[PDB]
Ligand binder design. Structure first.
Ligand SMILES: [Mg+2]
Ligand SMILES: [Mg+2]
Ligand SMILES: [Mg+2]
Ligand SMILES: [Mg+2]
Ligand SMILES: [Mg+2]
Ligand SMILES: [Mg+2]
Ligand SMILES: [Mg+2]
Ligand SMILES: [Mg+2]
Ligand SMILES: [Mg+2]
Ligand SMILES: [Mg+2]
Ligand SMILES: [Mg+2]
Ligand SMILES: [Mg+2]
Ligand SMILES: [Mg+2]
Ligand SMILES: [Mg+2]
Ligand SMILES: [Mg+2]
Lengths: 46, 63, 99
RNA sequence: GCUCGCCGGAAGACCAAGGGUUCCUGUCCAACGUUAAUCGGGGCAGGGUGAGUCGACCCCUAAGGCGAGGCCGAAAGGCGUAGUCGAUGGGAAACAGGUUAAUAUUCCUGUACUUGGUGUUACUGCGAAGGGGGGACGGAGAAGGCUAUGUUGGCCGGGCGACGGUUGUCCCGGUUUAAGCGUGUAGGCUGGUUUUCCAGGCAAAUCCGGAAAAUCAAGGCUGAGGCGUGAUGACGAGGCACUACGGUGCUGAAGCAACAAAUGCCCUGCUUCCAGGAAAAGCCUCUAAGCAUCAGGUAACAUCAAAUCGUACCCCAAACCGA
RNA sequence: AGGACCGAACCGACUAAUGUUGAAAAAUUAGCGGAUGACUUGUGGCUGGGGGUGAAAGGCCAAUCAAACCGGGAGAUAGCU
RNA sequence: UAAGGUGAUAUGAACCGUUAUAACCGGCGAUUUCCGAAUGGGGAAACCCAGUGUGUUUCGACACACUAUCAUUAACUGAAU
């Protein structure tokens, strides 16, 4: 049956992940702790 | 010849000083023949003076 | 002329893409990595004074880069401006250096 | 290559979503293909989707978002007026052949079209960020007419038959052909027209709204298809030469009628119902200044401009969601 | 017209078999219910964790739900193994 | 400072140098695209669109240059009164 996922790029920004991270103290914090702390190749947006 | 020479040439002619000399990068540098033995690399060994000229022109701005 | 503009450097760099040599029927054309803003007319004239060839028409467009690259995860685009521009027939590359 | 079998409201074809070169050519067969693999959606190369008319930009606005100042709120911040963004919707214009290993309403040929500036000519009130109209909009149902298109005949070309009959009553195939231009039809809708008067439309207005009169009617918009023209052209079964075996150059018959249809078109219609069905611009029109022999407006044509991005490459599936 | 009929698309899941190191972390096959409606679907938007949403099952809130995920207090505490 | 030298994974090509402006090192400069406080407005970051000035102008243009918001002061304008 409906397995909890259902992808949709557009629905992957302000609603979640993507570049929206650059709009909030914590949001932008995530990037630091993520990239810097333990260099991540990261990928977020595709 | 080249290198710091006529540094006062207000009657400057820096134009096409590059392309005309492009022989290497443009032509020669393709394969083999960009001076293989008698006189190879020139660009960074002398033709790199392109700055000196454009720099001067850039300086002779308050004319 | 009404060279008054920027005919100085509207054109630059070839392309030697797959389109190259494959795009030659009645008239070899070209590509040139033309500046982001050189328009068509200026391009038509650019190849006039220089290259000394006879241009029929120009076309051009844009093509955009794009890529992620960073100390962690950012990276961005690049931007360009292609430009076919046709020439003629009765006049080949003549004395020049192809590449 | 010849047989054989399977699907055919599809197991065919096209597109969207999503994918993101999987497309075509050459190559190579380690790994990947549940085996072999000279083969592939695998590897490595190249090629392949050039724009004034297709799309995005761009005008316009929907849901909603943001939001000068502003109202709130320990701070962060929430809400929201003007306003500004936001398509999945409205605004302008191109087709048919040809061609590349790969591009294509972008390149070539033939024939067009839109809009803006400038100019010449002619006629004229312009002339707004403004007023009015218009764009401009629901659901459901009931027809009629028509076209797509099919069938049969006629016409034209072709064959008379591995086995009994078919050598005119018969079997096979074709019988196509666009925008644009003229024609304003089946229908759809709505009375024209003139004059004068005004507490309305933020000011003005001949415009729209209201009021009176007066004279006629046979009007005025809208509109599918059909018919002429486009086109004694093209295409066209098929023959003839050349073949690289894929295909090429030339030539080229008939090319009509009758009936039958649509969920497509007239139909942003008609009828009816309650849940009573975007907006703004273009467009038409009316005036302001403001202009005041001017500028502008309309039309014809002459010319210049139409920038910049995208364009390469499965889709009920081996390219998407399921390792 | 209808808690009307069968009825494709479309939406849903009543039954059985198969699968159960699957083709598949819920499907395939044959049947099955709704199919002008409290219908169904594309795009985008709004509700945030003791909080949301809920024709109500503690259901759903990214294969996670009697209190999501990530990082931290953190080497929590563990008379237990 | 100096006989070499044109950064690295690879030469190679074509060359520059031996005396004292070739390299190479140090100081002061010149330049320094687009994004990013990003600041002309907008924006899914590296893209999109404008206003007002400029030079060369075959004198449409190209690019250029300025134009965010607050605070202090200055001068000028200036509502209901
Ligand atoms: Mg997007
Ligand atoms: Mg860390
Ligand atoms: Mg090409
Ligand atoms: Mg080609
Ligand atoms: Mg084996
Ligand atoms: Mg190669
Ligand atoms: Mg090749
Ligand atoms: Mg399937
Ligand atoms: Mg239900
Ligand atoms: Mg079966
Ligand atoms: Mg209930
Ligand atoms: Mg409930
Ligand atoms: Mg539970
Ligand atoms: Mg600047
Ligand atoms: Mg701001």
């Amino acid at each position: 049956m409906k397995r909890t996922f259902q992808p949709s790029v557009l629905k992957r920004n302000r609603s979640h992940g993507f570049r929206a991270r650059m709009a909030t103290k914590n949001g932008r914090q995530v990037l630091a702790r993520r990239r810097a702390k333990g260099r991540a190749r990261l990928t977020v947006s595709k | 010849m080249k290198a710091k020479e006529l540094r006062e040439k207000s009657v400057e002619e820096l134009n096409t000083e590059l392309l005309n000399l492009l022989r290497e990068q443009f032509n020669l540098r393709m394969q083999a023949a960009s001076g293989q033995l008698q006189q190879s690399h020139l660009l960074k060994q002398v033709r790199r003076d392109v700055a000196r000229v454009k720099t001067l022109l850039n300086e002779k701005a308050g004319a | 002329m009404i060279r008054e503009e920027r005919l100085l450097k509207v054109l630059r760099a070839p392309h030697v893409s797959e389109k190259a040599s494959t795009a030659m029927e009645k008239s070899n054309t070209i590509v040139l990595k033309v500046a982001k803003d050189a328009t068509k007319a200026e391009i038509k004239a650019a190849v006039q004074k220089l290259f000394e060839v006879e241009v029929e028409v120009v076309n051009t467009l844009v093509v955009k880069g794009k890529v992620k690259r960073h100390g962690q995860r950012i990276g961005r685009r690049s931007d360009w401006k292609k430009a076919y521009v046709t020439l003629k027939e009765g006049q080949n590359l003549d004395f020049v250096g192809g590449a």
